[PDB]
Amino acid sequence: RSPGVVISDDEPGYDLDLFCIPNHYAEDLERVFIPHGLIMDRTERLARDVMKEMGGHHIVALCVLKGGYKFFADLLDYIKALNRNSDRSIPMTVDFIRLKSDQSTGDIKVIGGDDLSTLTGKNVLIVEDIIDTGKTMQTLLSLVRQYNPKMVKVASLLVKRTPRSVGYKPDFVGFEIPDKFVVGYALDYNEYFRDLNHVCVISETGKAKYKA
Amino acid sequence: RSPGVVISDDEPGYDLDLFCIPNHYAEDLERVFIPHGLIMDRTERLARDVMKEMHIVALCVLKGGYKFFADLLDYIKALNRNSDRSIPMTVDFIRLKSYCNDQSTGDIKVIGGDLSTLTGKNVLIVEDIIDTGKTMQTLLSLVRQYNPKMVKVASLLVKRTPRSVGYKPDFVGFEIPDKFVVGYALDYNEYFRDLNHVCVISETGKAKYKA
Amino acid sequence: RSPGVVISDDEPGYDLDLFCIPNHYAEDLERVFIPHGLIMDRTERLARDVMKEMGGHHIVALCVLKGGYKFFADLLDYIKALNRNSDRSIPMTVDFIRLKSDQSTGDIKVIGGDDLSTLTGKNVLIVEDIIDTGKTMQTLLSLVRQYNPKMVKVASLLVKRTPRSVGYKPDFVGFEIPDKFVVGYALDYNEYFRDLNHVCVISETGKAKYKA
Amino acid sequence: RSPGVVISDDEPGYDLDLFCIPNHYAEDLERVFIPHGLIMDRTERLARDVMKEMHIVALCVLKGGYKFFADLLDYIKALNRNSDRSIPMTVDFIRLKSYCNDQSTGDIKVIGGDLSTLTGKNVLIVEDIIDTGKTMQTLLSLVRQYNPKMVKVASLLVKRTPRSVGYKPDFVGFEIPDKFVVGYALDYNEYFRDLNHVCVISETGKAKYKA
Ligand SMILES: Nc1nc2c(ncn2C[C@@H](CO)OCP(=O)(O)O)c(=O)[nH]1
Numbered sequence: 001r002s003p004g005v006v007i008s009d010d011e012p013g014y015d016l017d018l019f020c021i022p023n024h025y026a027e028d029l030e031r032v033f034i035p036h037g038l039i040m041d042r043t044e045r046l047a048r049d050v051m052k053e054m055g056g057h058h059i060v061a062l063c064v065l066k067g068g069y070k071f072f073a074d075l076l077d078y079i080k081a082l083n084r085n086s087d088r089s090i091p092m093t094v095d096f097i098r099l100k101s102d103q104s105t106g107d108i109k110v111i112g113g114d115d116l117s118t119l120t121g122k123n124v125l126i127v128e129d130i131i132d133t134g135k136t137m138q139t140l141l142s143l144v145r146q147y148n149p150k151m152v153k154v155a156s157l158l159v160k161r162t163p164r165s166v167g168y169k170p171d172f173v174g175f176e177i178p179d180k181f182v183v184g185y186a187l188d189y190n191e192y193f194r195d196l197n198h199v200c201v202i203s204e205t206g207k208a209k210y211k212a
Numbered sequence: 213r214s215p216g217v218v219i220s221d222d223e224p225g226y227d228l229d230l231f232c233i234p235n236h237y238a239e240d241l242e243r244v245f246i247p248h249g250l251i252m253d254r255t256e257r258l259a260r261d262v263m264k265e266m267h268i269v270a271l272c273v274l275k276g277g278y279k280f281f282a283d284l285l286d287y288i289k290a291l292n293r294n295s296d297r298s299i300p301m302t303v304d305f306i307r308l309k310s311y312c313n314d315q316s317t318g319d320i321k322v323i324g325g326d327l328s329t330l331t332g333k334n335v336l337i338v339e340d341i342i343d344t345g346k347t348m349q350t351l352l353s354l355v356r357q358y359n360p361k362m363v364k365v366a367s368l369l370v371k372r373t374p375r376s377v378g379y380k381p382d383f384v385g386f387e388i389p390d391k392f393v394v395g396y397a398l399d400y401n402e403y404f405r406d407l408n409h410v411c412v413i414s415e416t417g418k419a420k421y422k423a
Numbered sequence: 424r425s426p427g428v429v430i431s432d433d434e435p436g437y438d439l440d441l442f443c444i445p446n447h448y449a450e451d452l453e454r455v456f457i458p459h460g461l462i463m464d465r466t467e468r469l470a471r472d473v474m475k476e477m478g479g480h481h482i483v484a485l486c487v488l489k490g491g492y493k494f495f496a497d498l499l500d501y502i503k504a505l506n507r508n509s510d511r512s513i514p515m516t517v518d519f520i521r522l523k524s525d526q527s528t529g530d531i532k533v534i535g536g537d538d539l540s541t542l543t544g545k546n547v548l549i550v551e552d553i554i555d556t557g558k559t560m561q562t563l564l565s566l567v568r569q570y571n572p573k574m575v576k577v578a579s580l581l582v583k584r585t586p587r588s589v590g591y592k593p594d595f596v597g598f599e600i601p602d603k604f605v606v607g608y609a610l611d612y613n614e615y616f617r618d619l620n621h622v623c624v625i626s627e628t629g630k631a632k633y634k635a
Numbered sequence: 636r637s638p639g640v641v642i643s644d645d646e647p648g649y650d651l652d653l654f655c656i657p658n659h660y661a662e663d664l665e666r667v668f669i670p671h672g673l674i675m676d677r678t679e680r681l682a683r684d685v686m687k688e689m690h691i692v693a694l695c696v697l698k699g700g701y702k703f704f705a706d707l708l709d710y711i712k713a714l715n716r717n718s719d720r721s722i723p724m725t726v727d728f729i730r731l732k733s734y735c736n737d738q739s740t741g742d743i744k745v746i747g748g749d750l751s752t753l754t755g756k757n758v759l760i761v762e763d764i765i766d767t768g769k770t771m772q773t774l775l776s777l778v779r780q781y782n783p784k785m786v787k788v789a790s791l792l793v794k795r796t797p798r799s800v801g802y803k804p805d806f807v808g809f810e811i812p813d814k815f816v817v818g819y820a821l822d823y824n825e826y827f828r829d830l831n832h833v834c835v836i837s838e839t840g841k842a843k844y845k846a
């Protein structure tokens with residue numbers, strides 16, 4: 001059971017001054033955990049891992065849409081580049097499950113719940129950007145399985161190494177990270193950090209500056 | 213007002229053998245109108261234009277339209293990085309599906325995706341293609357419903373087809389001949405998602421991937 | 424005999440305001456002939472065209488180095504991405520032929536002429552960015568053939584549609600362009616335009632501003 | 636002074652199965668030190684650093700070194716685009732080849748590539764890797780010969796090896812363990828050019844691609 005690229009507690013970040021970061025976030029971050037390009041190369045591998053398990057068949061790519069879908073979009077770009085070479089053209093269904101608004105994350109409020117029965121009898125790939133406690137995903141899996149898919153696998157860019165974890169482990173994991181609050185790449189903080197390319201740890205002045 | 217990059221009816225696009233195209237689509241396309249990289253370069257200029265005119269809320273039209281939206285917003289993020297202050301960008305989503313009608317003439321739209329973040333904001337409607345202009349018109353009256361500070365439409369593609377005469381698009385990537393196109397952001401019954409270029413579907417393609 | 428992507432006299436450019444161009448070149452260009460991304464997609468195809476003819480064997484990639492090697496670098500990046508999939512790893516020799524300093528371009532002055540006999544018995548791919556009269560290339564071919572390669576093919580990004588052409592046609596051509604003086608992408612004018620992504624036509628104020 | 640991104644001897648790099656690696660190199664590598672995208676992000680910062688310190692002439696070390704040079708200059712071009720005035724950038728080239736010496740201890744360098752554009756200019760020496768530091772030292776005394784206004788060394792890689800003690804590099808991408816690396820910019824007898832990541836060669840790789 002590969003936990004992905006492990007970012008240790010004892011290593012962890014890169015120094016902020018080692019990478020290009022927008023000047024308006026100078027004081028808003030602690031460390032860079034995962035540079036943009038590292039995310040990309042790992043995602044390229046995830047796509048290949050996904051195709052070994054699910055390739056050659058239709059498959060339904062389902063984005064867990066909360067703040068954004070940047071990871072979904074990049075994973076799909078890589079999966080699509082792998083599909084190019086196949087002798088037969090393989091159809092690909094792209095869908096989003098939108099979840100509405102972090103201490104009761106297990107309670108899901110789905111907004112777009114139309115023709116959920118399109119999942120029935122289908123090979124479903126659920127794509128998440130971050131798993132923390134894992135409560136959201138385990139309840140989302142309860143919903144999805146009631147529609148009887150042929151197969152359900154979950155890919156998550158990030159899994160947080162927390163005691164608060166309920167023990168849910170995704171089938172595909174990009175990176176296993178320390179138990180710190182991260183922003184950037186695909187993760188916004190109240191609509192900020194959208195322009196930050198790298199997964200980084202928010203600072204306390206960032207937390208205070210950008211609060212809702 | 214630009215009409216955008218005008219692709220003429222006279223010698224439209226490029227021969228298939230001049231660009232890289234998945235081997236499984238060899239019989240399925242007629243010509244390539246817009247190679248991927250050309251889409252990207254024009255989208256970069258579109259992002260620049262959007263920032264000129266337009267707090268902004270960017271509206272993605274769900275399912276179809278994540279692709280062009282993602283790229284357009286990527287370029288907008290690239291311009292945003294240099295600002296003195298980190299300036300908030302809201303992304304909103306609506307689901308919109310169209311169905312053919314074999315009777316009458318009446319149009320079928322099903323809207324499914326909450327729009328509480330639209331009042332007093334500058335709204336950008338992002339579309340993939342304008343043909344009849346009914347999707348645009350539907351998106352407009354739905355946004356006008358929440359009383360926006362500003363409303364603009366950006367669309368990667370506009371077909372040279374006769375239409376009623378709604379509100380011409382503000383930001384246009386490409387003005388293209390009246391052909392049915394697939395690739396980049398446009399699928400055909402879930403096929404062509406792996407095709408990066410905007411190309412005209414062939415009759416072999418239509419019958420092979422029909423549904 | 425495919426002349427590449429033909430850019431007509433009657434179409435030709437795109438309007439400058441249709442693309443992103445650095446502000447310091449605002450007044451220095453007439454039209455954009457080939458946007459950066461178009462160059463890339465055509466180059467991707469060239470790489471595949473090259474591998475159909477020369478693939479599966481070592482091959483020596485020889486850059487005609489004058490001002491720069493941007494086209495060489497991008498073509499090789501694409502050729503290398505095609506080599507990734509092969510069952511056997513295929514060695515690739517990368518070399519440069521440097522030509523020293525446009526009315527007697529047929530006279531070549533080669534600077535780096537060391538172990539030119541490495542070309543002997545080898546499959547050689549000569550890479551050029553622009554052909555105008557074609558005199559440079561035909562004399563360069565005279566030199567190269569004297570070292571007895573197994574095969575010589577020439578790829579050029581651009582071929583200019585000029586009456587001044589001596590009739591040399593490359594084996595691989597990206598684009599056939601009108602008879603206008605172009606800069607950008609790989610083409611500098613006295614060290615300017617290095618930062619311009621697109622192949623564009625220099626204006627008269629650009630010509631005057633940036634002259635040697 | 637940065638030493639750059641420090642890759643430690645303690646748990647160095649990543650397992651091969653965590654990144655995409657050409658199938659033909661499956662037996663030929665030990666571990667991956669630096670995935671391609673990580674190289675690119677750091678190079679972007681290096682380009683920013685170069686522009687801080689440094690008219691500039693950028694010196695490519697021919698054959699080996701076109702790759703890292705091209706990427707470093709790409710990022711420098713990206714920063715340059717925004718300037719109020721188009722600022723000239725000179726690129727220069729020298730050929731440099733090293734040969735093993737099985738006797739003595741004496742070093743073999745062959746220099747082959749004209750350097751008239753160096754007097755009174757800021758010169759940037761661009762290298763791929765510093766191990767012994769003899770290439771750097773050779774490039775230095777050759778550039779000092781033409782009396783530059785400024786001289787700087789940028790190198791993507793610096794090995795944690797004992798060396799004489801020349802002029803430590805000014806711009807360093809990565810400080811890496813004392814292992815023999817291939818990929819990205821470094822070949823092994825013409826192999827690994829299609830490998831995008833910096834990785835340690837295996838004993839199977841060494842014997843298979845030996846020469
Ligand atoms: N941006 C960001 N968000 C987080 C983080 N940790 C938990 N969350 C919140 C949610 C993500 O929706 O974690 C979900 P769960 O796995 O706790 O149910 C974090 O580090 N960064």
Ligand SMILES: Nc1nc2c(ncn2C[C@@H](CO)OCP(=O)(O)O)c(=O)[nH]1
Nearest residue numbers: 341342343344345346347391392393398
């Ligand atoms: N793939 C593809 N789809 C299209 C095309 N033209 C119209 N459509 C469909 C609708 C969008 O659902 O056109 C938008 P409009 O007719 O509502 O303006 C087309 O050429 N290719």
Ligand SMILES: Nc1nc2c(ncn2C[C@@H](CO)OCP(=O)(O)O)c(=O)[nH]1
Nearest residue numbers: 528554555556557558559603604605610
């Ligand atoms: N930048 C640029 N250079 C050019 C051009 N036309 C001829 N040249 C000069 C040379 C290129 O070295 O043409 C060589 P030949 O084919 O005339 O020998 C041009 O349009 N742009």
Ligand SMILES: Nc1nc2c(ncn2C[C@@H](CO)OCP(=O)(O)O)c(=O)[nH]1
Nearest residue numbers: 764765766767768769770814815816821
């Ligand atoms: N591919 C590869 N090559 C290397 C390496 N270490 C030294 N070299 C060779 C020379 C450059 O020719 O090292 C530079 P220096 O020893 O002169 O500083 C290495 O790890 N990989």
